[PDB]
Amino acid sequence: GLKAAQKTLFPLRSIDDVVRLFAAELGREEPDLVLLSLVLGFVEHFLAVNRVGLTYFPVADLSIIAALYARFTAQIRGAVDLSLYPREGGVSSRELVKKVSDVIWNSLSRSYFKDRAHIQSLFSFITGTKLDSSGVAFAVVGACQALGLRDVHLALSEDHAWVVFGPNGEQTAEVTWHGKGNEDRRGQTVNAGVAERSWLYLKGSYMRCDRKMEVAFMVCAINPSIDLHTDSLELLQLQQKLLWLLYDLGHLERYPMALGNLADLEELEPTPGRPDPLTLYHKGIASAKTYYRDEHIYPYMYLAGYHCRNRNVREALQAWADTATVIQDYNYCREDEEIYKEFFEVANDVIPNLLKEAASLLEAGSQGSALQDPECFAHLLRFYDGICKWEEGSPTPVLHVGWATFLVQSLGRFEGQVRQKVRIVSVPVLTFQSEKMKGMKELLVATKINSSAIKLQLTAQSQVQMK
């Protein structure tokens, strides 16, 4: 609008006032994404970007927010002539979606750091003409809503955002960039990415947001970071309270990562009477299993990270093994690098450091250690098996020798008497899906792991050194 009913809670003088605004907007047929993103961006600006003069909460005066809102709607409605894009029957056209995307795109500063913090909201778009990659996609959806295009919705994978629109909301359109140095595909469908079974498009099991989930997205996009060492407690509390509002309304039901984020927030500062982080992590996994064919990686990464931070090696290993069991049915494609980096860091930094400490604790007499649990060895094996199976049929390889030394080291953290207890069964018991781990089976139980043979098997390296 802004409509009169949207204005009554102003001025927003507190976190709870912002929550009241979100509660009011979420009670409407269409929560106003532009209003809410401007409010979030405003409060984030004065709580994380510039806290000079902050004495409690940056009062969001209606005059300020309405002026920002007016700047956005004036820019969108001036630059997008809906008459050039007749809507068949409550359905938007690819050309109209492309136009809105172009309008947002062409509004941005010609040169800026695209990965900066706090450039995710419409406040950044208006006051700084800067948006990050997913912020452009959100702004396109917000602009489309402002234009009355009820069918245009945010589509979210775990690393990318686009829009769905059109008849039955069945059309997809790229509206922003992805990554760095990647070829722009704005205006195109995501069908090639779905067909190639990349993680980036989740084999089609990506989120198709309704407006409430788009509110959830902007809430998940709140960035409390003031600097590398300091988060705004105010923004953490705001994001946490808004996520609980969304949770209670059912709007995180189909948003696995939001449930992980909420679990993380609860671990940092538990809300009395709320589910434990673990319950929330498993709700995120349940959400992925229920709505997304169990084809999401981050629900298990969230869970694994929790167990890792609590130094719970067994459950961390189980969760990472579960992460790999999801990734195994993907093809590793160009633009999947973010999840490659995650698997790489887990295999080659996080697990080694966990097992290193576990080894020291085992030497100090720990009981029930993951290193003496063959099920934990099996988890480690299943983690690598899923990564190896992921690699099979992929257009780009996953493993290389830079993984092999960490594999040998991690395997060696388990004594042979533990490793021998895992029975690798063909099609603690473990079935390998990957041919690489199948060929590695006999090597996994030697008292002294054959490092060179493991390396050859993991990398499919043909030969050893000539001389």
């Binding site: 990965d115 690393d159 990318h160 996009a221 992980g260 984020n261 981050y298 990270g305």
Partner: peptide
């Protein structure tokens, strides 16, 4: 911290 897609698990 390195830019994460929103709702990505935390960096470190």
């Amino acid at each position: 911290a390195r830019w994460a897609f929103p709702x990505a698990p935390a960096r470190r």
